Ligand binder design. Structure first.
Ligand SMILES: *[C@@H]1O[C@H](CO)[C@@H](O[C@H]2O[C@H](CO)[C@@H](O)[C@H](O)[C@H]2NC(C)=O)[C@H](O)[C@H]1NC(C)=O
Ligand SMILES: CC(=O)N[C@H]1[C@H]([C@H](O)[C@H](O)CO)O[C@@](O)(C(=O)O)C[C@@H]1O
Ligand SMILES: CC(=O)N[C@@H]1[C@@H](O)[C@H](O)[C@@H](CO)O[C@H]1O
Ligand SMILES: Nc1c2c(nc3ccccc13)CCCC2
Ligand SMILES: Nc1c2c(nc3ccccc13)CCCC2
Ligand SMILES: Nc1c2c(nc3ccccc13)CCCC2
Ligand SMILES: *[C@@H]1O[C@H](CO)[C@@H](O)[C@H](O)[C@H]1NC(C)=O
Ligand SMILES: *[C@@H]1O[C@H](CO)[C@@H](O)[C@H](O)[C@H]1NC(C)=O
Lengths: 531, 532, 531
């Protein structure tokens, strides 16, 4: 009969789902509320605990995804899902739910490691239901939890002061982790061993939680995939008041004071805030006016609750409570996916430096390179050869290194020097699940590792023995890390720890260890930004 | 100093004098003259009506607003296509049926200069007349330049397929502006007996549409279509238009019970709600999700029974159209950069394998209409010649350009010629210094590049080489000679052969010379392919 | 291939439908517009000519029915339709359409008689699509046309002055008759021979058209089935201003002036006017307050365009169209359907005079019998027996006679005395198509003749031979009347003309002639109301 688990707030009914090659059916619970719906006065406020229910709550239907651009959200889900057919999702402000995939025999007593997944999507789009934890759970014997949190205006609107601090979405992630602590034992998970992992904005969220005192003791291991707190495009520094006013004005609100803007925005309907979102044209590279004034995403701010100061300052603090941390990147972070989703103005296979400099300046919101420095940056990367074809490839490497490569290594180095176990990787592989619109030459594009991590080869059809093995290896590395804070194990290539030798693992068709990931790039960019 | 005051049928207008270096007679410029009644309220989705007469003098010296459209796309396109020094920021408004006049004539005396009426492009969804400054062309060639505006998007082309909302309101506005020219241009030193209509892209398709429409009879005497004709499928809705109409009404929160209900409901919506609906439909952007055959890139021309009695193809099969001198042209790389960029094509890698190419070509259905079964043959034909992946990408862009512009342009020219009318063709291949900085140096003759020569950008903007200056002078000469005689030829200019059975055409660029049989093989390949 | 006809405003495409045993198929055209949609500023104004269309208009789907109580309209359509299955109809203010059923060979030239049907429904509900003309058209070789007209508030709102005269629905009826004159020949119809017929409110409409100068030359024969201009409830006499104001107030409008009330009601959405309609509780007997103040329906008024004076004044003046006129009633007009639809308070097979008197006073809006006269009226109908079962039956008769019986005979008499051919009938048969909720004892209830007139026995599945025989005879009489202004013909029982002998036909399983229909009832009520 259907699995029924008892949680703090009430009973929940899930369903059993078997996976070829496993005798123990996985118990799946969809749409479990971990907080009170952020509706009405609750919009733009920290999450409150869910209210208890009387009988058995049916947890067998996908929850709606947080309000976001429905077309961009659906496209993204289609490109990222590990399941056979993408699941159409409904939109709603009532989205603070989480899905659980437990391989534990609930009739007995278990304490399996827990892996909490934080999806990406620039903090503007995305959903938990996009990711099916069936394969990872069944193959690695771990409890997989996929959570949701407020996005866009709903999750990050900030006036820069106490009337709307911001980071609601991040507070939601924290609320989910607190929920896991109080309830995961009932699903056969060990609250004493929770690993948080995510990619892109999800990786940046994990990185933020790692530096936050609010998340202390809510997790014991962390994994950031293609995204950290130093990925400047997701973190807003300085005064955020101007942005708040641009949003309120576009929404048809007065900007008399912070309290007035917030109060007015709380009165707007979901559709009105969604229409405001579309007018702001987020997720897109603005090619008009001054690049310095364009804000393609609404993200993390230094609110004073979640983050006491900038991530750059919080890293140097060699004494906070640490946890094993794995930080990785993909070979071509800006190879296709991101540029495509941002309508990046690149269509020619040949790029000249004059144009490169123009594009880089227009890319200010993503790279933050002062106009006076564009020449140096461009010359450093493109002055290499006289092949304009190779020049555009190097240009894509430049964006990638600034957005993910250098930030990741800098975070890893600081985590290491803080005395905590650190691991790094570089993923280079072109999955068969890639979009038909993605050139075959792109290898290790943003998000390419997700298919291996969530066992797509075991849910989706068609996959070479090589792709299947790669997924088994990756899931093993990730689950081993979940269990012991060390990815190593028998039958797996050796993954050196990221110490002073800066060893890291190159993951792909052929997997081996290497040293000094992005060494020269970090040196160059650190000196450039120093100016 | 003393501003020029002209007497129009509806009242007096006051303009301003502007001097262009190299000419004694200052050009009299009149901005924002209304040629129709503001299409507000119950007038939305109906034919344009005559402007109301006014007393005293109407000050015509401020740019009029551009018709309601995506403000970000509208403004960006304006910056990319303007020929003046600084782009003029424009206001949005449903009250947009205005035109600007640039007359080089001496209004104190009598003048009958040839008149050139410009119709801007922008997929019938965006654009403005003010983007194009007629000062240079007017002074340099002694012609009266008129830039007109017309309703765009929902306001200009919403159609229910029946009598409740036939559609083509934007084209009816173009007709009304031409009618205003006939009745008023003489007062500005123009000759209503010699009116030339020219436009680029959607503007070119409009010109082509006017050539095939009974409503435009005796309104123009010469025509020029630049990069766009009535056979550019994407702009001409063929088949049942009801589905698109219902989808627009639904998005606007309207019931679809009957056509009259849809129309009545949309008429009650505010300008902002319709603009929000427009932004939600996400027009002029490649939809990468779902079935490509359901994507609706834009709202456009329909066979309404008033403007167009039947499809363009049928109208030309039978020589049923205005046999005025016609110049049809294209640029070397129509889909080179500007359009793929504005439509958000996924070409960040700049390279492309055949499998990826067939995938995008299929997603490009709304633009090219190539059945999935035919994609392999179409792709093999263009990319199979080389193994280089970057080159393949270049050939892929040529393939899309040939289908949207190249082939349609030649087919139209041939039908116009075979109808015994004077026909001319050209292929523009040059990269202006006024190109966007984000546009690589390898893109030459991209969509819109010829506009800078036609409107004398080298004489209004700065940094033009002597070669570019010489090109613009030659092009304006050709265009104005054509406007004057229906033949572009003149002393001092390369010989431009007429597009007859020999199919001669002019290659315009750094090197300007006559050639023959433009896109001959391509027309043959595609005419056969589309026949299954 | 499909039938394509050329009409003044353009081409229309219909469809061929064959009837078992008929060689030539019937051409059917559904939803042809005969006027411009009465939307926006056209609400509460006379109908305007329809705009022409350019190609071929597809007229093969049923048009919507004019806005009205959706629950009530659907129920009524289901009870009256002659089709095998009732068609669900959509609501819309855009409802000025008509359906055509022509048995003619369109490839030739035909001049078949035309019968224009005006549906009933108290001028508050109803639809043309409820009535299928296939059978009547094929069996009698006549062109059948079913029309629609504005209903309720949209069709009859009147301020009592020039700012909103009222009777928009009747003007819509005139517009359709005008369209028939200009276009019917194209459908094989003869504009020189048009017969208008309807039942209930449609019967009253036909009666009003006979008295209106606006309809001269639009028809040549008329048939009123259970309803005439003397059926008081459908005709507003006196000052209509108070009702106008009550509707305005219910809709949230000010009543400062007529123009202000009209202008305000024009800005209301269809839904708002429908909600106002529901709050008014039309088509329902009000059991609260003074019976004299309740208005169960919005109807005809003496506007000065359609009607220049009350029917009574126009009859005395002998000022009207002297076309052949057939006027009939059913045995039990208030037998079940109407009392049921009005939520009439009667659930006992027995009724005492005291209760009867209270009910009759409550029925004021339907009968207009002053309270001081209630005793005499009641004593005259019930006082003859002690059987309280027979008393309630007699109570229903009294309502029926006052609403239909007497008014019909008086109208027949005035028409006869005006020198025009007149015929009367009394229908007494219980169709097998009656509702399952209608007691078997009710015979000749309101609307029962409709199934015979429209040939339900030929469209519905398996009707008894007796019922089939009755319908063939009725359609025969109706069609002979249509072509000759005299129903008589070969093989049909003799139907005497309604002259000084006052002969009329008793239609039923046994059809025979009789004399002096409701003669004593008319004498009684005429004397009573004269007080
Ligand atoms: C005319 O309209 C009808 C109804 O819209 C079309 O009929 C087809 O679709 C209807 C259901 O959506 C059905 O009622 C019809 O039975 C169905 N069959 C056909 C094709 O007749 C019809 O195609 C239209 N014809 C024209 C000339 O457009
Ligand atoms: C919306 C509108 O009508 N603006 C018009 C303005 C106003 O008339 C003036 O600013 C006076 O208010 O001036 C013009 O006519 C003009 O000078 O050419 C252009 C423009 O169309
Ligand atoms: C929306 C949905 O899929 N719910 C269905 C429900 O309708 C059905 O009764 C049940 C049978 O067990 O299965 C589930
Ligand atoms: N996944 C995305 C990320 C970023 N931008 C994006 C923009 C559009 C769609 C997806 C995105 C910025 C860096 C973090 C990841
Ligand atoms: N997106 C388009 C633009 C232009 N023409 C177009 C023609 C067809 C389809 C899309 C188009 C002209 C310049 C502005 C952009
Ligand atoms: N009140 C009346 C109702 C109906 N018809 C009527 C016909 C005439 C006069 C009053 C009527 C049909 C059913 C609903 C009520
Ligand atoms: C739970 O809901 C699902 C549909 O989402 C349904 O299949 C199932 O019957 C429900 N369980 C119970 C017992 O309500
Ligand atoms: C005409 O309009 C211009 C622009 O606003 C203004 O500067 C000028 O004073 C006006 N002249 C007249 C005639 O009012």
């Amino acid at each position: 009969s259907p699995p029924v688990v008892d949680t703090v707030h009430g009973k929940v009914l899930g369903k059993f789902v078997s996976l070829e090659g496993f005798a123990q059916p996985v118990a799946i619970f969809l749409g479990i509320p971990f907080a009170k719906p952020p509706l009405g006065p609750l919009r733009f406020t920290p999450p409150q605990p869910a209210e208890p229910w009387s009988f058995v709550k049916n947890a067998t239907s996908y929850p709606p995804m947080c309000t976001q651009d429905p077309k961009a959200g659906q496209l993204l889900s289609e490109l990222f899902t590990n399941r056979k057919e993408n699941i159409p999702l409904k939109l709603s402000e009532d989205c603070l739910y989480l899905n659980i995939y437990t391989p534990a025999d609930l009739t007995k007593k278990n304490r399996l490691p827990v892996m909490v997944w934080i999806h990406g999507g620039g903090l503007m789009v995305g959903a938990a239901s996009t990711y099916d934890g069936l394969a990872l759970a069944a193959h690695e014997n771990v409890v997989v939890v996929t959570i949701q949190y407020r996005l866009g205006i709903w999750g990050f609107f900030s006036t820069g002061d106490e009337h709307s601090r911001g980071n609601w979405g991040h507070l939601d992630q924290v609320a989910a982790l607190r929920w896991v602590q109080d309830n995961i034992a009932s699903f056969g998970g060990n609250p004493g061993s929770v690993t948080i992992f995510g990619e892109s904005a999800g990786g940046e969220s994990v990185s933020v939680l790692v530096l936050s005192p609010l998340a202390k003791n809510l997790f014991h291991r962390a994994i950031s995939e293609s995204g950290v707190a130093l990925t400047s495009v997701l973190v807003k520094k300085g005064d955020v008041k101007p942005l708040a006013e641009q949003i309120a004005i576009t929404a048809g609100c007065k900007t008399t004071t912070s309290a007035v803007m917030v109060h007015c925005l709380r009165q707007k309907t979901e559709e009105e805030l969604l229409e405001t979102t579309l007018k702001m044209k987020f997720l897109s590279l603005d090619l008009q006016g001054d690049p310095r004034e364009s804000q393609p995403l609404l993200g993390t701010v230094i609110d004073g609750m979640l983050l006491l100061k900038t991530p750059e300052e919080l890293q140097a603090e060699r004494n906070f409570h640490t946890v094993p941390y794995m930080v990785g990147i993909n070979k071509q972070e800006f190879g296709w996916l991101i540029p495509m989703l941002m309508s990046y103005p690149l269509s020619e296979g040949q790029l000249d430096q004059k144009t490169a400099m123009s594009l880089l300046w227009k890319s200010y919101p993503l790279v933050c390179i002062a106009k006076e420095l564009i020449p140096e940056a461009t010359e450093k990367y493109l002055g290499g050869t006289d092949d304009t074809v190779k020049k555009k490839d190097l240009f894509l490497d430049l964006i990638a290194d600034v957005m993910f490569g250098v930030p990741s290594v800098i975070v890893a180095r600081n985590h290491r020097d803080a005395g905590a176990p650190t691991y790094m990787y570089e993923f280079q592989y072109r999955p068969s699940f890639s979009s038909d619109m993605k050139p075959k030459t792109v290898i290790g594009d943003h998000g390419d590792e997700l298919f291996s991590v969530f066992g797509a080869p075991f849910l989706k059809e068609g996959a070479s023995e090589e792709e299947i093995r790669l997924s088994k290896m990756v899931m093993k590395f990730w689950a081993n890390f979940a269990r012991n804070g060390n990815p190593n194990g028998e039958g797996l290539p050796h993954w050196p720890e990221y110490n002073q030798k800066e060893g890291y693992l190159q993951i792909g068709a052929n997997t081996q260890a290497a040293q000094k990931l992005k060494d020269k790039e970090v040196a160059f960019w650190t000196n450039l930004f120093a100016k």
